[PDB]
Amino acid sequence: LDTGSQTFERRVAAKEQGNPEDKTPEITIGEAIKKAFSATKNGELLYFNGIPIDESCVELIFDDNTSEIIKEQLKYLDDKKIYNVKLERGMNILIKVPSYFT
């Protein structure tokens, strides 16, 4: 989470793909972002310290394989919001908070 004045790096556990014995609970990317930064939610908004970090009000940045997974899974899903795909292992998300935004 690159607020601009600061940075907060987190690690959220994700389930191994093939293994049927990996009982790690699955969660979406939005729930992972809420848990990793302890953000408090307001209806559909998602507030950090005072900053909105919901999907509409930020600038997400992925690496190639994460972007591939998320684009692949946005089609076979409904409600094409990136905060609704669910956190495979090895994902790399970087939430940039915009400098000027109305």
Partner 1 sequence: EDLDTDNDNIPDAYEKNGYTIKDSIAVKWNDSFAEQGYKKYVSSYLESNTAGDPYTDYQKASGSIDKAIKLEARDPLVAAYPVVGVGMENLIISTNE
Of 2, 3, 28, 37, the one binding partner 1 (CB under 8 A) is 37
CB 28 within 8 A of CB 83: yes
What is the closest distance, in whole angstroms, from the C-beta atom of residue 15 to partner 1 in the complex?
A: 9
What residues between 13 and 32 interact with partner 1 by CB under 8 A? 13, 18-25, 27, 32
Alpha-carbon distances of 26 from 13, 23, 43, 88, rounded to whole Å: 9, 9, 22, 9
Give 67's DSSP letter: H
Of 38, 64, 75, 100, the one binding partner 1 (CB under 8 A) is 38
Beta-carbon count within 10 A of 46 CB: 22
What is the closest distance, in whole angstroms, from the C-beta atom of residue 22 to partner 1 in the complex?
A: 7
- Contacts with partner 1, residue ranges (CB under 8 A): 9-13, 18-25, 27, 32, 35-38
